[model samples]
Target: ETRPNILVVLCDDLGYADVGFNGSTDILTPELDNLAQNGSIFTSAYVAHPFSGPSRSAILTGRYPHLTGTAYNLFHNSSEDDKDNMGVPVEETYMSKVLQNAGYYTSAIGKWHLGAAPKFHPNKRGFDDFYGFLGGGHDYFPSEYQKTYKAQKKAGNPNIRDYVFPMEHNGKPANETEYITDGFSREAIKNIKIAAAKKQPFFIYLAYNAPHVPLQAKAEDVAKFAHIKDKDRRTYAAMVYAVDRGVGKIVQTLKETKQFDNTLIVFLSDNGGNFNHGANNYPLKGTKGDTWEGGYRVPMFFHWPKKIKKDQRFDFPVSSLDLYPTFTGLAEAKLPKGKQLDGKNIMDDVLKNTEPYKDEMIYSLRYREGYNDVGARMGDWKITRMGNEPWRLHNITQDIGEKKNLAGRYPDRLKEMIAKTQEWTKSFVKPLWVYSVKDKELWESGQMPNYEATFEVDKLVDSPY
Candidate 1:
C-alpha cells in the first residue's frame, strides 16, 4: 500500500493542439508526447470553467467553479483601499489539504491565482511550501518586471500588475530569476530531491504560466522558430518550447533522483488558449473564453509508470476536477467531514480499462454579464448557447467544430439536457469577492470574454491571462 510521489504540471491558457501529443508540429512538446506513451492519454478531458480562476478552483476542490464562489473571478492584488477580497474560501477544503493530512509533503509552485490575501495563500491552504508568483500570471522576461510594490504604490493608478508581483518562497519574499519558466523547473527539481532525501511521499503542483499573455520569450529560443513567419506566434512558439524544455528537465531530474518509477505525473492546461495572445486553439471553434470546445477541451494525460499501463489511450471524457479524487483515492486519504467532492475516483477504473466509458453528461455554464451561454454533453450529443441565441446541438464525436445544429431535430433530448444542467447548477453559489468586471465589457461588446484583461503594466489587481 505505497503512495507514490505525485507531480501535476498545469499550463496556463495553452491551446488544445499545442503539444506534440495532441498533433502539434510547430509548438513541439516531446516531453508530453513521451509521457503520453508511458501512461494514459485522455482525449476528451475538459475544464469545469472556460476561464482561469474558476477552472483552477474546480481542479483544486474537485467541485464545479460555481460552488467555490470564485467562479470565473480573477484573483486580484491591489492597495488596501482598492484591494480585491475575492478568492476560494477557506471553508472549502482543497485536495492538497487532504493529502497533507495523509502524511504527504505538498508543495505548490508557480501561479497561486486562487487568492492574493494571506488568508488564502497556498501556505495557509495546506501546501507545505509555495513558490513562484502569487497571481494569475507572471513576467517571462526580466524587462517586464516592475520596480517594487512600494514604488508602484507611490506612483499610483494603473497599479494592477500580477506579472510583476514579487516572487514568494513558502511565505517569505524571494528574488526574481532570468526566465520564470526555467525557475519553476529548477525549484521543482530541488523540491523533488529534498522530498526524496527526506523519504517522504510528496505532492508537487508545478503550475507553469507559460504561453500565456505578454508573449515574451528568450531571443535565443525565439531564434529557433524563425521558420514561423508571424512574429508574435514565433514568440509564442518559443514560450511553449521553454515549457517543453522545462518538462524535460523535470522528468530528467525525477529519473536521476530515482523517483520516476514511483511517481504519478499529470500534465494539462488550466483551460484553452487566448487567440489574442498568439495562441492557436485550432480544429476547434472559439478560443479561451468561449463556451465552445476550444475553450475547455484541452490536451491532458496521466503518467504513472508503476501502476498505469504504457501507451494507454482512453477516450472517456474526464475533467480537471478528477485529479483531486483520483490522487486522493490512490493516497488512501479521507474526504473531509461535511465536505463533498464532485469528481469521481477514476484511477482504478482507468487502469482496469473498464466501467464508465464516458457514459455521463458533463455540464458547463458561461453566462457572463447579460450574455447567456450554457453547454451540456451527454455522450456524443452536446448543446451550447452563446448569448440569448438559440440552443444548438451537435454530436461532438463527428463535429468537433460544432458546425451542424441538431437541436431542431432533437428537441426532446435538448429539453431534457437543459433541465438537467439547470438542476446541476443549483449546487454552485454566485461568485463571492472574486468577480470579473473586465469580462463584462468583452461579453457586452460581442467579443469573447477573457479570464483576465491586462493591457498596461503595474496594475495591482490582475486576472488569469
Candidate 2:
C-alpha cells in the first residue's frame, strides 16, 4: 500500500519547553528528542483552542472550532435525570474517518475528551478500537479508577452526572491494573499487534493524559526528578518521564514490528499546559486560558523515517489543524467528498523549509462562560484580545515572550489586524455547549472582563503553565 501507518501521539497539558526537544533541561524527554532527530520540529506550533475539548474538536476535523459550533468545552449535564447529551455534532467528519474509508484500521487510546455521549464516542468517530477515559481528566493511579470502575461497572455503566466512569475499552467499562499511562501503552501495543496481523495500514491516536492534574507520579519517577526543588515540579517531571517512556515503548514496538520506517508518527500537546496545576509556559506570555502565545503555542514534531527528511527544524507558525490534510496527503487518503477544510497540507511546505503559512491568520478563540478571548497570528505578528481590553499587537518572532506591545507605534497595522480578526469572527457560531453556569452568568453580567490573567510578572516560577 502507498499509505503508511499513522500514529498521532497527543499529550494533555504539556508546555512548549517541557521536553528536551524544546530546550527543557529539568525534565528530560530523550525519546522525544530522538524522534525529533529523525523528523522535523515546528518551532512555532499553535492549537485552535487553549483548552481541551474544543481544541481537540478542531484537530480531529481540520475545521475551526469556532466555525464548528464548539467554541466552548463539551458538557454533559444530568444530576437528577438520565438525559445527558453533549458531543461533537454527528455530522462532523474526523481524520480517522477519512483514513478508515481508505482501508485503514483506526484505534483511539487514552483520554477521549471530545464528548462522553454515545454519539460522539471514538467508536462512532471511525475508530475500530477505543481504549481510554471519556472525560476531560482522569486519575493517574489504577486504584483510584478501579474503585470507580467497580462501583460503576456493577451499575451497568449507567449514565452519571460527574467525571467518574471515564474508563472504557471498545465501548465497554474497563478495569485496568497498571498505572494509567503504562496501561495505555500496553493497550496501544495490543492494537499494533492486531494491525500487524491485518497487514493493512493503521491509524492510532494515542492521547496520553499525563501531568494534567492531581499531580501524581510513579514513586521511582518522582525520585528521578528529586533534584528539582519544587515538589509539584518533581511530580510533574515524573509524569512527563512516564509519557516519554511510553512513547519510547511505542517506538520500539513499531521498530520490532518492522513498521517504524513506514509509520508517520506525530507528537503534540492538546494545548498549552495549565499553570494552576504546576505547568510552566515560561518564554510565552500568559497562562493556559489567556489569549497569549503561551496559551496556544506548543512543541510538536512529525516523524516518518522513510518519507520525511530527518534532523531538521521548521520555524514557521503551523496550526495543529494542518495535521488532518497533511496526514491525508501522506496517507494518500482522499479528502472528504465536498467539505471545506480550514487546514492545509503542511508536509509539502515543511519539506521545502519555506513559510508554509505565509500571511495567513491562524486563530485561537475560546468563549468561556464569562467572556470571549481571541488571538490571531499572521506570520511573526500576533494580535490578542481579552474581554473589552484594547487589542495588543506584538512581533512574536522578535519577542518570543510577547512582552512588548507595538499597537501604539503601528496603528495602521494594528487597525488592519483588528479588522481582519473581526471579519474572521463573523464565521464563528454561538457555542453548542456553555463552559460553566457561573462563568456564563458573569459573562452576561458585563462587568468582570472575560479574561484569564490573575498575576502579572516578567516571568513565572519562571516555570510551569
Candidate 3:
C-alpha cells in the first residue's frame, strides 16, 4: 500500500471560471488545463467561508470557522495588542501535523494567514519547513516592497504595513529576489526535490497569494494577455498565469523525479474572486464576501495518476473541509484522540460518482454589520440571506446565476433547510479576532453576528437551535 505525496495548490481569491478547465476563454491556464483534463474537476466545490482566513482554517482543521473561533480574518500586524498575539488555537490539530506525524515531510509555503504569533507558526503546527509571509496578504514585487519597508522603518513608523515586510522561512528572513508568487514556487520545487531525495512521502501546502490585490504582475507575463484592453484584467490574468507557470514547473519536476504517478495534486482557490480586483466569477451571483454562490464556490480539481481516473468531471458538491479527512485517510494517518471534523473523506465516493454528503447541508456564514449573511445548500436547493434581506431559496443546480426566488414557491422546504442551518450554528463559538478595530468593537458590543435575526426563518422563531 503506497501513500501518495499530497500537494495542495491553493490560489488566493481565484474566480470560479478563471481557469481554462473551468470554462474561461480568456485568462488562459494551459498548464492547469492540462492537469485538470487528466484529473477530476469538481463543479460544485465550496470552501467553508466566503473569505480567506476562515476558509483556509476550514481546509486545514476540517472544522467550520465558527467552531474554531476563527470566523474572521486575522489583521496583519494587529495594533490591538493581544490581537497580534492571537492565532489558531494550538489545541486544534492541523492536517499538516497529522501527515507529519504519519511520517510525511510536510512543508507549508506561501501566505500563512492563520497566525503571526510563535505559537501558531507553521513549524510548531507540524510543518517541517515553512516559507512566505505570516500576514493576510503581501506586495508581489520584492524590490519595490523591500524599499518601502526600509524607508518606513527609517522614518520610525512603529506600525508599518505587513505587506512590505520581508518574507521568512522558519522565522528567518529569506533573501527573496523574484516576484512573491514565483519565489513561493521556487521554494516548493526545492522542497519537493528535498523530499524526493529523503525518500519521504511529502505533504506540500503550496498556498499562492497571487491575483488577490494590489493588481500587480510581471511585465512579460502581462504581455501574454495583450488582447485584454482592461489594465486590471490584464494584470490579473498575468498573476494567474504566473501560478499556472509554477504548476507547470512543479508537474515537470515531479515527472523528472519519477514521482508524478504517485503524487496527489489538488488545485483550488481559497475563496471566490473579488470582481473589483479584476476577477470575474462569470454566471455566479456575487463576489468574494457574499454568501451567494460566487463567494465560496471555487474552481477545484484533483490530479492523481495512480488511482484517479482521467478526464472526469464530478458534479457532486464537495467542501474544502473534506480535504483534511481525505488527505489523512489517503495517508493512512490516525486522527488524534478527541479530534473533531465537520467533513468526511470523499475520495472513495468521488471515484464511484456517488455523493459523499448526500442530503446533508453545506453551510456558509459571513458576519455583516449588526447582522449575519448565510447560505446553506442541500442537494440542488439553497437558502441564502444577505444582511437584513429576507431569506431566499434557489435551486442552485437549475439556476446557477441564482436568478429566481423559489422561496415563495417552496416554503416548507426552505423553512426546513433554514432550520437545519440555524441548528448548525449551535456549535459555533465567538470569533477570536477580527480584521479591523471597528469590527472588534462591534463584536464586543454584540452588534455584529446578531444570529438571532439571521436565523429568523418565518415570523422570528426563538432559538431555532
Candidate 4:
C-alpha cells in the first residue's frame, strides 16, 4: 500500500553520445548502461531548453522556462517590477512540494541552481532537507574552514565568513577535501540508508555538478582516460567516470539497503555537452549553447526493477517536461489549484506502447549572442529558423547530424512549419532586454534590462583541483 520511492539523478551538461549505450566506446558509464539495461532507455528524449536553469526549472515545475520565470541562467536576477527576470519564482509550487504534502519525504542534494533567494531555496520550496550551493556552479574542492563572503566578493557573504566556493552541509561553509562528486554521492547514500531505516518512501534529487566545467578529476580516474588526446576532454571523461561511479554507488546502496525493488530511479542530464569545454556530442552536431538536437536532446534512462520487465529502448521523442507529471501520476499526488502544466502523464502510455508521442516543436532563446533560434519537430521532419530566414528543414530520422537541408524540396512543409514557429514566438514574451541595435547586430546581441549577464567561462585549469 506504500508509495514507491523516487530517485532522480541529473547530470550537468552531459551529451547524447557520451554514454556507452549511446555509442561512446572511450567513456565508461557502466552504471548508467546498467540502468538502461534494466529499465527503459529513451533514445530520443529532449528538454524544453538547452541550458541548466531553464531545463531544470521545467523539469521541476512541469512548466516551460518562460512560464516558470527562470527561463534562463541563475545569475540573471529579476527586478521586483519584472516577474520573469528573476530565478524560479518563490510562489510556484514544485513537484517535490506536492509529493511531500502527499506524505513522501522529499530531499534535494547537490546543485540547487533554480534560485538563490532565501525564499526560493529548496528547503522552502518543497525539499525537507537541502545540502548544496544555490548557485549554478561550485568549486570541486574546498580548503579548511570555508566562509561565506558578500555579493560580488569571493564566496559572496560578508556576514558569514570562512565560506568556500563549493558550499557544504546545508549551505554552510565547510572544507570538503574529497572530490565534490564523491561527497555528493556519499551524502546521497547516507540519506538513502536513513530513509530505508525509517521505512519511509523518500524522494531524493541527486543533482551532480560534475562534468559541467572546471574539468578536474582525481588523477587516478583521469588516468583511465589517457587514450583521449585533448587534455580538457580527457579530464571531462574522467569527471564522467566519477559520475558513473557515483551512480554505481547509489544503485549498490539501494540494493544493499533492500530498497532496490521499491524505488523508481530516473537518470538524465540538465542539457547537452559543451564541446568547447571538452564535452562531446559526437554523432549529434552542435553544442550546449545552440538549440540544435545536440543541445536539447540528452540521454534519459528510467529504472524500476519491479515495474519494468527487461531493458527496452523507447524511440518515441519525450521531454523532461514529462517527469513532473509522471512522478505525480506514480505518486497519485494532487496538483495545486489554479495551475496548468505543459507536460503529460505518460507513464502508462510509455509502458503500454500506446500512441507514439512526438514533440511538435522545441523552443529555445539564448539572449547572450544575437540569435533567437526555434526548432519545430514533426516526426522525422524538423525545421530550424533563426530570425527571419527561411525555415531550414531536415529529416532528423535520416540525418541525425543535420548536415543536409531538405527545405528546398519541401517548400510547402517548410512554410507550414515556419508559420507554426512564428505563432509560438508570438506567444513568447520578449525578454526585457534586446540584443538588436542600430548596426547589423545578431539576434542575441540585444540585452534585457535587469537580467544579469551570463556567467563567463574561466580557463579549464581555473578550477581548484
Candidate 5:
C-alpha cells in the first residue's frame, strides 16, 4: 500500500489549440502530445477564473476565487476603498500542507502569483522547498548582482521593484544566461532526482511562467517555427515549444531515474490563452477574459503508468479544484474535521468504467469595474449572466463556438441554472479587499471606481484585461 509520487506541471496562459493532440498541426509539442496519447486526456477541463492569480489560488485551495476571498487582482498599496486587496488568508489550508502532513516531500517551482509579500510566500504555505519567483511574472534573463532599487523601478512595481530573475539555489536571485524555461526544467529535474534518490514519495507542483507575457524565446526555438506569418504568434509558438521541451525533460528524467512507473503526472494550463497576445482558441468563441469557452476551457492530461492504461480520452467536464481531493484520495490522506471541499474524488470514476462521468455545474465570478459576469455549466447547457440580465444559454456540445443563444428558447433550464448560480453566490463572501495597491490607486485617481461605489451597466460588460 505504498503511495505513488505525484508531479503536476502547470503552464501559464496556454490555449486549447497550442498542443499537437488538440489539432494544432503547425506548432510542435511532441512531448505533450505523447503524454496525452499515453495518458488520459480531458476534453472538457476548466478553471474558475481566466486570470493567473485567482485561478491558481482556486486550484491550490479547492475553493472558488470568491470563496477564497481573492476574487480579483489586488493592488500593492492604495487608500481607495478596495475589496479584493488581501493575500490568501493565512487561515486557508493548501493541498501541499495536506500532503506534507501525510509524510510526503512537497515542493513548488515557477511562477507563484498568489502573493507578492514574504508572509504569503510558497514556503510558508506548506511547500517544503520553493524555487521560484514570488510575483506574477519575471524577466526571462535577469542581470547579475543587480541593485534592488533599479530592478524595482525598472519593473514599475514600487512594492516589488527589488525582484530579479534566474532564481539560483532556493529562491536566491542570480544572474542566469539560460532561458527561464530551461532553468525551471533543470531545477525541477534536480529536485525529482533528489527525491528519487531518497526513495521518498514526493509531490512536485511545477508551475511554469512561459507564454504569459513579454513573450521571449530562445533564437533556436523561435527558428523552429519561423514559417508562421504573425510575429506574435511565431513568438508564442516558440514559447510553447520551450514549454514542451521542458515537459519532455521532466518526463525523461523520471524515466531515467526509474521513477516513472511510480509517479502520477498531471499537465494543464492555468487558464485559456490570450488571443491578443497571439494565442488561438480555435473552436472556442472568446479569448482569455470572456465568459465563453475560450476564457476557461484548457488542455488537461493525466498519466500514471502503474494505474492507468494507455491512451484514453475522458470527455467528462472536470475542474482544477478536483485535483486536491483526487490527490488525497490517491495518497489515502485524511481531510481536516468538519472541512468541506468543493471537488470530488473522481479517480475510480476516471480509471474504472464503473459510472459515467456526471456533468457538474462549474462557476466563475469576474467582479471588476463595477460589473460582474458569472457562468454555470451543466451537461450541454451553459448559462452566463452579467449584472441582472436574463441568462444566456448555449448548448456547448453543439455550439462549441457559443455562436447561438438558446436561453430565450428554453426558459426553464436557464432559470434553473440561474437559480443555482444565485444560491452558489450566496454561500460565498463578497470580495472585501484588493490584491494590488496599484489597483486601489487607479480607483482613487478616478480612472476606475470600486465595484461597490458604482453601478454602471455598460461598465460591467467591459473586458477584464
Candidate 6:
C-alpha cells in the first residue's frame, strides 16, 4: 500500500521531561528513546487544551474546543440527567471517520474521554473497532476494581465512579486479566495482527491512561524505580516504563508483520503532567490546567522509517489539532463536506525540514472559575494570560520557562497579537458542558470564562462577570 499505517500513542498527563528521549535521567524509556532517535522530535509541540477531554476533542476534530463547544471535560463522576447526551457534536467530522471512509481499518484502544454516551462511542465516531472504557480514566488493577465495582453495585450504588467500570470491546464487556496499561498494549498488538491479516492500512489510536492518577502500578514494575527515592516519583516512573515496554512490544509486532517501514508511529501526551501526583514538567512553568508551557506543551516524536527525518528536533509550535489534518492528508482521504479545520497538514514541512505555520497562531485557552487562562503562540513570540492577570509576552524560543516577560519591550507587537487572539475568540461557541453543576451554574450566569477581561490588554477587571 502507498499509504502508511498510522499509530498515535497518547499518554495521559505525562510530563515533558519524563521520557528518556525528553531527558529524563530517573525514568528509562529505551524503546521510546530509540524510536525518537530514529525520528524527528518536536520540542515545541502543544496540545489544543491544557486538559484531557478538550485536548482529545481537538486531536480528532482538527478544531479548537471553543469552536466545538467542547472546552470543558465531561465530568466522569457526575449524576447529571443529561450526561448521556453530552459529547462533541456529531456534525463535526472526526479524522478517524475520514480515514475509515477511505478504507482504513481504524481502532481506538483506550481512554475514550471525549464522551460516554452511545452516540459518542468510538465505533460511532468512525472507528471500526473500539476497545476501552468510555470515561476519563480507569483503575489500573482489574482485580481490585472488580471487587469494588461489584460490591458497590451490590450495595445499590447507582452512580459508581467510572474508574472501576468494566472494560469494553465494541460495547461488550471484555474481561481484562492483566493490569490496565499492559492490557491496552496487548490489545494494540492483537489489532495490529488483525490488520496485517486483513491486508488493509490501519489507524490505531492507543490512548494509554497510564501514570495519570490513582498512583497504581504493578509491584514488579514499581520495583524497578526503587532508586527514585520519592514514593510517588518511583510509582510514576514505573508507570511510564510500562508504557515504554508496551511500545517496544508493538514495534516488534510491526516488524514481524513487515509493516515497520510504512508505519507512522506518533507519540505524545494528552496534556502536561500533574506535578502534584509525581509527574514532573521540569523547566516549563505551570501544570495541567494553566496556559503555561508546562500545561499544554508536551514531548512529541514522529517516527516513520525513511519518511520522517531522523535525529532532528523541530522547534516550531505544533498543536495537537494539526494531527487531524496531517493524518487525513497522509491517508489521502477527503474531508467531510464543509468540514472546517483549524490546522494545516504538516507532512511536507516535516519531510523537507522547513517551518510550518511560520506566521500562524496556535492558541490554547482554558476557562477558569471567573476568568480564562490563555496562551497564543506565533512564530517565536507568545502571549500568556493567567486568571485575571495582565498579558505577558515572551520570546518562547528563548525562554521556554516563560520567566522573562517582555510585554513592555514590544508594546505594538503585544497589542497586535492580543487583538488577534481576541479575534480568534469570536468563533467560540458556548460550552456544551462544564465539570460541575456549580460551574455550569456560573457559566449560565455569565460569570465563568470572563472572556472580556481575559482578552483585555490593560485594566484588569476585579468584578466577576
Task: Write model 5 residue lDDT over 23-85, tens digit each, in one string.
Answer: 787889999899889889888888888788888988888888788777775442322222423
Task: Return model 4's CA RMSD, one decimal.
Answer: 8.0
Clashing pairs in 2: 275-465, 279-464, 279-465, 280-463, 280-464, 280-465
Q: What local distance difference test score does each model get?
A: 0.79, 0.80, 0.91, 0.75, 0.77, 0.90
How would you encode candidate 2's per-residue C-alpha lDDT over 398-435 as one tens digit per residue? Answer: 98887787877887887677677777766666566566
Summarize candidate 6's per-residue lDDT along 107-177 as a digit string, tens digits.
Answer: 99989887777777798899999998988899999999999999999999988898998999998997998
lDDT assessment of candidate 6? 0.90
How well does candidate 6 score on lDDT at residue 291?
Answer: 93
347 Cα displacement, candidate 6 (Å): 0.5
TM match of model 2 to true structure? 0.90
lDDT of 3 by residue, 253-303 (tens): 999988899999999999999999899998898999999999999999999
- What's the distance in Å from true for residue 77, model 3? 0.9
* C-alpha RMSD values across all candidates: 7.6, 5.6, 2.8, 8.0, 5.2, 2.4
lDDT of 1: 0.79
What does candidate 4 score on TM?
A: 0.86
Segments in model 3 whose C-alpha atoms lie over 4 Å from true places: 79-84, 459-465
Stretches of candidate 4 above 4 Å error? 76-85, 144-166, 356-362, 368-370, 386-389, 430-465
Q: Write the per-residue lDDT of candidate 4 for residues 174-202, one digit (tens) a residue.
A: 45667888988988998998888888888
What lDDT tens digits, residue by residue, belong to model 1 across residues 136-212?
78777654575555477678847556667678897677675568888888888889989988889999999988888
Order of candidate numbers by TM-score, starting with the best? 6, 3, 2, 1, 5, 4
* lDDT comparison, 1 vs 4, better candidate: 1
Q: Residue 206 deviation, candidate 2, in Å?
A: 0.5
The segments of candidate 2 whose C-alpha lies over 4 angstroms from its true place after superposition are 76-84, 148-166, 368-370, 439-465
